[PDB]
Design a protein around this ligand. Structure first.
Ligand SMILES: *C[C@@H](*)[C@H]1/C(=C/c2[nH]c(/C=C3N=C(/C=C4\NC(=O)C(CC)=C4C)C(C)=C\3CCC(=O)O)c(CCC(=O)O)c2C)NC(=O)[C@@H]1C
Ligand SMILES: *C[C@@H](*)[C@H]1/C(=C/c2[nH]c(/C=C3N=C(/C=C4\NC(=O)C(CC)=C4C)C(C)=C\3CCC(=O)O)c(CCC(=O)O)c2C)NC(=O)[C@@H]1C
Ligand SMILES: *[C@H](C)[C@H]1/C(=C/c2[nH]c(/C=C3N=C(/C=C4\NC(=O)C(CC)=C4C)C(C)=C\3CCC(=O)O)c(CCC(=O)O)c2C)NC(=O)[C@@H]1C
Ligand SMILES: *[C@H](C)[C@H]1/C(=C/c2[nH]c(/C=C3N=C(/C=C4\NC(=O)C(CC)=C4C)C(C)=C\3CCC(=O)O)c(CCC(=O)O)c2C)NC(=O)[C@@H]1C
Ligand SMILES: *[C@H](C)[C@H]1/C(=C/c2[nH]c(/C=C3N=C(/C=C4\NC(=O)C(CC)=C4C)C(C)=C\3CCC(=O)O)c(CCC(=O)O)c2C)NC(=O)[C@@H]1C
Ligand SMILES: *[C@H](C)[C@H]1/C(=C/c2[nH]c(/C=C3N=C(/C=C4\NC(=O)C(CC)=C4C)C(C)=C\3CCC(=O)O)c(CCC(=O)O)c2C)NC(=O)[C@@H]1C
Ligand SMILES: *[C@H](C)[C@H]1/C(=C/c2[nH]c(/C=C3N=C(/C=C4\NC(=O)C(CC)=C4C)C(C)=C\3CCC(=O)O)c(CCC(=O)O)c2C)NC(=O)[C@@H]1C
Ligand SMILES: *[C@H](C)[C@H]1/C(=C/c2[nH]c(/C=C3N=C(/C=C4\NC(=O)C(CC)=C4C)C(C)=C\3CCC(=O)O)c(CCC(=O)O)c2C)NC(=O)[C@@H]1C
Ligand SMILES: CCC1=C(C)/C(=C/C2=NC(=C\c3[nH]c(/C=C4\NC(=O)[C@H](C)[C@H]4CC)c(C)c3CCC(=O)O)/C(CCC(=O)O)=C2C)NC1=O
Ligand SMILES: CCC1=C(C)/C(=C/C2=NC(=C\c3[nH]c(/C=C4\NC(=O)[C@H](C)[C@H]4CC)c(C)c3CCC(=O)O)/C(CCC(=O)O)=C2C)NC1=O
Lengths: 160, 160, 161, 161, 161, 160, 161, 160, 161, 160
């Protein structure tokens, strides 16, 4: 989280938190009251947004469910949908957390090294998270959309 | 500043600006109006603040203005008041910047060596900064007084 | 590196003055132009890769750089581009977030001409590629935020050439 | 290391559970009190050397520790003990800010016990110094953050003992 | 006395109309600036004595006024003059809070000119003192309420002169 | 309004406004939008309120529309209805103002003498006002109903 | 006179004691009933004259008091008695708001019994009228304010009798 | 208290409490919880505050414990500390009451003749009270510190 | 009579100061708002008579002012209107050409209440007539120039009542 | 001003503003920026203009600063320079107004009586104004120099 990111820098430089660092640590909490319902709203759709994004993604890329495709079969499709659910859970975790910490530390550092022995399309995950961000914002208002858009941008900005 | 501390931090990893960093930069630009107003209010009353802080300092530590004192004499006292004005200027710079980065480079790094060479009481200078903090917080509303005094306490802690 | 906030403080500290009306007006202008910059930074991000591909197709590819002899002739020379680029983005997205040339002169555009002269690397080609990226980002970002992004891209191209 | 927030995130990611009412209750309970944590951390940072001074004066010095045959004897050992004093204070502040002793376990208590055993450090004296730290810090910060500051000093004392 | 809200209500009642769009826009025009006025009033109340001291130092004392033959000579007259300064400052604060110089017309300037002429008070010196207080108040409050504060001091000065 | 009442006491004691008075003004300006909403609702629904309050007052005491009654006749009753409209407008003004200075200065001082001169039943007018109280509180939410009814009860008390 | 908050303060000030736990509990007990007291006070204030009318109807009029030889005979004595009822109602409201009969003892009951006996006023009839007022007030206020409303009326009746 | 000096004003005119008076009589009861908690907090640390205030007082003004001092001797400094405890009790009383009303009656009206007959230095007692203010605000949160500092500053100003 | 240009000079002359930034800002604001005023003056002219007729129909006529007993019952009382009006136009067209109340207070609205009180002439009616012309001129003049014409008309109506 | 001279001129005939007067008002508002700039330029250099003009005047007419001169002595010379500064201020007022209406009422009507009572040489004051005109025209471009100088010749002619 933000506290972890600040304390890591402080301990790396061997010093207390800074006079501009506490101003950010306090501003990270005052919007937490609003943000709690923002990440909450995506929480009770978690088995629905991914379910719809399957219908947004494997018709866009039909080779994912074609004989030369990686997601042929009901169980193979289930794996891709479970991966989408994992990414949705992680992005919600980071939304509740602050900085990129929850997603980067768990399911972002080593995507290419995983898929290197997995044969799963990174350019397909690009559109997958594009559609996830596309469908997860209309549940929110524009005020919440402004507090949700950058949190969605990091996946398609990192895997690239 | 906050912008420098945020952009260069997301440049040491070869990534774009973090979705966690497309925030507190935001609160900084939001509170920039209040920061500018507070800095202007401190700047208008620079002479009165310096004069009263020097008065309080010379009462509380009268040994410095004695014959065996570093600041004994009219022009050695003028130099002490000039140093107090310098630190008030640095505090205003820190307030506008939103971080103690500029004040740190301008008037803190090596201050121990400089004052040891000149044979000046660093605890006396710290007490002068505290008196300046009291006089400054006497001229401001509670929130703005706390905001200015937080930087003043940074100066007091650093000169230590 | 420097932003507007730090630049005003630095050139008001060298002469030892408090922040006057002019300095407050400059800081006021930056603070008022502090939201479109943040929005355009996020717009440049995510759509970065398509921006690079469009710029490459518009300026670099379909020219001398791709046939035998070019500096982008084979793969890994095509790969040193997209790289090379992603800088000139990344940077100047930093510039149009902490708006000042500064970063572009200290980190990216400094000795780059010497490096390119020692490594081949057609400077006219790599500046035409910069202007293509400028056009595509001006298209993607918006009407008003297309400017100052055009400013930093023009600064990068002019400094390189 | 972890704080209250990322501790909740990891504790739910281990079984793959989305954030529920209980988890959001824990996060709310952490968020409602951290502002006092920020004020207490600022006070401790501003008064770091003074706290070490009073803690040493009350618990260590004016004793056989500073005399010949003591562990704190000689300026080298005195500076070593005061640096350890400062390190304990800073890590206690980090733990109180984070709301979790994970950083204390990972970067303070790991190896410190048998390290002090191999070096001859009096663990009882270090525990007394830590409690003097906690007393001075509780005096300074006030009722708002007194127990939150003191719990991690007690954690350090219990880990050492 | 009357303020913005009561002024709108009265100037609609005397014509027997209901609250229309114009009066509504006037009332939200007052409502939007409520916080700035109260903040400026609190600052002025906290710094009341210092403002009078600085204004007197800049405009009145250390001159022929405080020497024999000056009107401000003798302790009785000095106390009366600083009391008058406090009068002007407090009524300017009330006028700034209410957004209306009607209180200034009813309770400050009515007969003040003839009273000062009867007592022999220097009206030009009084106006100079009022302007010095206005300058100090504009310095303290800041651009937020500087203009609103200054308009009522200017109203007082124009009424007196 | 609350501003006038605070300023009057401050001028009476010859002192600037207290922090408590400033907090009261801040709360009053915070409640301004709610006060405007209640006033707008009553203004929009005034005519029906007037007609129902008149009917309620008349069937509580029909003697006023009797041969020996003050309000006997069409033009004699139209004046009573116009008076009820007058006090409804006054209570709307009091709602927007926040306290009863306008109502006091417009419709209760000397009202005893005026109604004694006109030989109109003041207690009957009070019951007619209470009918307006009931009809108006029937068209508002609970706390808005309490807010408007407090001013209505003020008018009822001020009548006698 | 004193309220419920300055009555405990005066009890602890004539002993030199601080505010221990029992004082805090007493003040908490007063504070928890703040809103109901205010609502009851507003209700009595809005329904004052009707209360006196019903109290007089139930207790005084239609008897020998209002006939020749009575102490309510003649308009002057009737007006005096109703004014006394108004004063009793208002001071009962004040006492109920303050949570203390100190104001009742200080400003009503002092010398009132001897004034009444020096004038010939029937104290029994006065007590009956006060009780009728208490009944009407308890009816109007409801369960929430009935008991603490009636305690000060019974205090007045007990002080008179 | 706010209660006592609001019924008194109404009785001075012989009316009932006004609409603008029954709402100001509600903010005080709301802040009563905070006032009680602050007073209990100060009461818990009464001896430490007294001892430290005496220490700073004697350091600032050692003449009072000089042979030519009013409080020269162990019993004379014991009486000085007892007066300090008295004033701290009065400040807690003022904080709970919400006004300065009880403290004026108990320990301010006539204090000039008090310490003139006893030959005690008023500026010395004022400096002791200021040391108490510092020690007390050292043990409170910022808003509560300001609320207690109001009454401490009132005591300092009244002893003048 | 004064305009903005003369008003600023007169205000800055009694205190003997040169034109500073605030005065130059006020004069600059008037100079920037100097074309819409001229255009709206010509628009008010030409269509003056239809404006008066529409305002009369909207407010004055169709009321008790035309029936027997009214102050516009016959002609020549009707003729004193259109006249009476054409002032409140004419003037305030002068005001929104040399924008300042001044002229409206010195020539039109000064003793007008006394004259009307001595001649009958319902002031509420003649203020409703003013507001009718305010509406019609706001309609005819335009969106932005509807204001400051509304300002001067509101000043006239408020001053009269 | 021109607005005053135009609106009141079309008010003595009971007509609206003439179409011949819905002109040069327009030229005045067009040239308002230039007039404001010229006035600010003159105001910035008020001390240099006054000093040099007084120097030239005292060289041209040394009799006034002689023992039998009206302006003999240091404070009598100070008063002469103050009068010159007054006339420079009036010239700036005339420049901003666009007409000599304000300077006429402020410092021309009755000037003959005032200076005859004080026994001051009006031709000497006129020569001082001419020297001020020369110094002012030395600091301005040709068009602006002519524009300011024309008002200067107005003052010179009026003091005659
Ligand atoms: C519920 C109506 C009761 C009633 C009323 C009644 N009123 C009149 C006449 C007048 N009433 C007023 C009132 C006001 N003037 C004000 O300024 C205000 C407050 C803003 C008020 C309330 C006035 C001025 C008049 C005079 C006539 C007029 O102005 O046009 C009359 C007529 C009296 C008569 O007997 O001729 C009546 C009857 N009568 C009832 O029975 C109702 C209870
Ligand atoms: C039901 C009423 C009974 C009654 C009363 C009665 N009272 C008087 C006269 C006075 N009453 C008062 C009262 C007060 N003084 C106070 O200070 C207070 C509280 C603050 C009160 C209530 C006083 C002072 C007088 C004397 C002066 C005056 O009249 O104002 C009278 C008049 C007696 C007479 O005629 O001389 C009466 C009749 N009488 C009854 O029969 C009832 C039982
Ligand atoms: C692309 C449009 C053009 C092009 C480029 C090209 N570049 C290289 C190699 C390098 N480029 C860099 C660049 C940078 N280093 C920095 O630090 C920055 C700023 C932060 C820049 C811009 C460097 C240092 C190298 C050399 C080391 C490396 O490769 O990392 C090559 C490879 C050359 C080779 O084969 O040896 C190429 C081809 N080629 C084109 O055709 C365009 C004109
Ligand atoms: C005296 C000329 C100066 C001075 C000294 C001073 N010292 C102390 C306290 C201590 N000094 C020591 C010293 C040593 N420990 C070692 O191992 C060695 C090396 C052999 C030395 C020299 C220690 C340990 C202490 C702490 C107390 C203790 O010994 O237990 C003080 C007291 C400070 C306090 O805050 O109490 C003082 C004053 N003071 C002067 O003014 C001289 C310049
Ligand atoms: C001080 C209150 C007591 C004391 C201490 C003492 N410590 C050492 C030496 C070391 N202390 C450390 C400590 C740490 N390593 C860590 O990682 C952390 C937390 C992040 C700590 C606190 C280490 C590594 C050493 C060894 C290396 C070094 O000296 O820096 C000494 C010196 C022993 C010697 O002379 O060899 C002493 C004296 N002594 C007392 O009397 C106190 C009870
Ligand atoms: C001297 C023993 C003490 C002292 C005095 C002090 N006074 C001033 C300034 C002023 N004093 C006066 C006094 C009077 N005006 C009157 O009409 C009378 C009655 C005859 C008196 C006594 C005035 C008017 C002033 C203001 C300046 C002026 O005269 O124009 C100062 C200067 C304070 C400042 O801030 O400049 C001082 C220092 N100070 C001490 O410490 C002594 C105990
Ligand atoms: C009759 C023409 C009118 C009328 C009268 C009415 N009166 C009452 C009640 C009372 N009237 C009195 C009167 C007096 N007491 C005195 O000392 C004197 C002076 C000699 C007088 C005139 C009193 C005391 C009462 C109260 C009851 C009692 O006498 O004990 C009522 C009853 C009111 C009620 O609420 O019950 C009435 C109706 N009513 C009319 O309509 C006529 C105009
Ligand atoms: C018309 C909407 C209303 C009205 C008016 C009315 N007015 C008069 C008579 C006069 N009106 C004026 C007015 C002015 N003189 C000025 O100098 C100015 C400002 C520049 C004004 C507004 C005066 C002086 C008179 C008397 C002389 C004259 O007639 O010129 C009358 C005639 C009254 C009579 O018959 O004696 C009337 C009717 N009447 C309405 O009904 C409207 C409310
Ligand atoms: C010796 C190793 C080597 C190869 C092979 C190579 C290929 C190569 N093909 C390219 C483009 C391209 N290549 C193709 C098409 C094809 N590509 C094929 O291998 C198929 C035969 C065919 C599809 C059936 C197209 C269409 C483009 C243009 C870019 C685009 O697809 O948008 C480019 C980019 C530059 C350019 O446009 O010319 C590279 C690097 N370069 C190398 O160094
Ligand atoms: C005693 C002399 C006298 C008269 C007659 C007079 C008339 C008069 N007619 C009016 C209106 C009016 N008069 C009429 C109509 C008519 N008028 C006629 O004489 C015809 C019979 C009829 C048309 C066939 C209409 C329609 C209006 C409304 C204004 C309008 O036309 O727009 C008005 C304007 C006020 C109003 O609307 O009532 C007046 C003053 N005043 C006087 O002093």
């Amino acid at each position: 989280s933000v506290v972890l990111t600040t304390i890591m820098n402080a301990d790396q430089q061997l010093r207390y938190p800074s006079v501009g660092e506490l101003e950010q640590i306090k501003n990270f909490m005052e919007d937490s009251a609003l943000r709690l319902k923002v990440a909450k709203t995506l929480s009770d759709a978690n088995d629905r947004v991914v379910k719809q994004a399957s219908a947004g993604l494997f018709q866009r890329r039909p080779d994912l469910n074609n004989p030369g495709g990686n997601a042929y079969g009901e169980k193979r499709l289930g794996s891709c949908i479970r991966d989408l659910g994992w990414y949705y859970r992680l992005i919600t975790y980071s939304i509740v957390a602050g900085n990129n910490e929850p997603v980067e530390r768990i399911g972002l550092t080593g995507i290419f090294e995983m898929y290197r022995v997995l044969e799963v399309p990174i350019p397909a995950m690009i559109e997958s998270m594009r559609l996830l961000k596309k469908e997860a914002l209309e549940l929110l208002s524009p005020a919440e959309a402004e507090i949700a858009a950058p949190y969605f941008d990091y996946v398609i900005g990192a895997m690239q | 500043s906050v912008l420098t501390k945020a952009i260069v931090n997301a440049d040491a990893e070869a990534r774009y600006l973090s979705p966690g960093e497309l925030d507190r930069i935001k609160s900084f630009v939001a509170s920039g109006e209040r920061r500018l107003r507070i800095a202007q209010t401190l700047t208008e009353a620079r002479e009165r603040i310096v004069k009263q802080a020097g008065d309080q300092l010379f009462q509380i530590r009268p040994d410095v203005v004695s014959p065996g004192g570093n600041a004994y004499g009219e022009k050695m006292t003028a130099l002490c008041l000039r140093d107090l004005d310098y630190y008030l200027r640095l505090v205003t710079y820190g307030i506008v910047a939103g971080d103690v980065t500029p004040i740190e480079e301008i008037g803190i790094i090596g201050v121990k060596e400089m004052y040891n060479s000149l044979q000046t009481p660093i605890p006396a200078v710290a007490e002068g900064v505290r008196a300046m903090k009291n006089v400054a917080t006497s001229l401001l509303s509670g929130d703005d007084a706390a905001e200015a005094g937080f930087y003043f306490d940074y100066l007091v802690g650093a000169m230590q | 590196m420097q932003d507007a906030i730090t630049a005003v403080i630095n050139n008001y500290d060298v002469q030892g003055k408090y922040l006057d009306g002019a300095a407050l007006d400059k800081l006021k202008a930056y603070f008022t132009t502090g939201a479109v910059r943040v929005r355009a930074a996020a717009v440049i991000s995510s759509n970065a890769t398509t921006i690079i591909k469009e710029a490459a197709a518009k300026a670099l590819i379909y020219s001398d750089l791709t046939r035998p002899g070019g500096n982008m002739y084979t793969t890994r020379r095509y790969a040193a581009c997209i790289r090379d680029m992603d800088y000139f983005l990344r940077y100047a997205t930093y510039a149009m977030l902490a708006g000042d040339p500064s970063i572009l002169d200290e980190r990216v555009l400094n000795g780059l001409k010497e490096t390119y002269n020692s490594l081949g690397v057609p400077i006219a080609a790599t500046v035409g590629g910069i202007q293509a990226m400028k056009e595509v980002v001006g298209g993607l970002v918006g009407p008003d935020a297309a400017k100052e992004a055009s400013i930093y891209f023009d600064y990068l191209s002019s400094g390189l050439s």
